[PDB]
């Protein structure tokens, strides 16, 4: 983004906020943090909210094997489990048919 200009970055942040509004409606405190992140006098709030998101995804880890607490890291393990479950599902469907 270092090449971009102020307007482009502002518009991109606006779009991302629009997405986060839907992605956050379920949560209460994280939604409140997102709302507080709108102040222009205190930009640091943004980063705080970011941390909150991670601090949320950290607790959403399911089982001990998925405890690559870095959320960007657990995605690969989740996809691996999806592939394993796909093959298992094919086997189970075969079994049920017979």
């Amino acid at each position: 983004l270092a090449y971009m200009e102020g307007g482009a970055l502002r518009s991109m942040s606006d779009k991302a906020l629009g997405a986060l509004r839907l992605a956050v409606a379920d949560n209460e405190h994280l939604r409140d943090a997102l709302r507080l992140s709108e102040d222009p006098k205190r930009p640091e709030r943004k980063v705080q909210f970011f941390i909150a998101v991670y601090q949320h995804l950290r607790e959403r880890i399911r089982q001990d094997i998925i405890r690559t607490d870095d959320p960007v890291d657990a995605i690969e393990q989740m996809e691996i489990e999806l592939a394993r479950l796909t093959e298992e599902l094919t086997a189970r469907e075969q079994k049920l048919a017979i």
Partner: peptide, 17 residues
């Protein structure tokens, strides 16, 4: 996870830069 992560990064890094 994917949606939240990507949207939060796109939301913050833009204003940061």
């Amino acid at each position: 996870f994917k949606h939240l992560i990507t949207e939060a990064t796109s939301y913050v890094s833009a204003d940061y830069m």
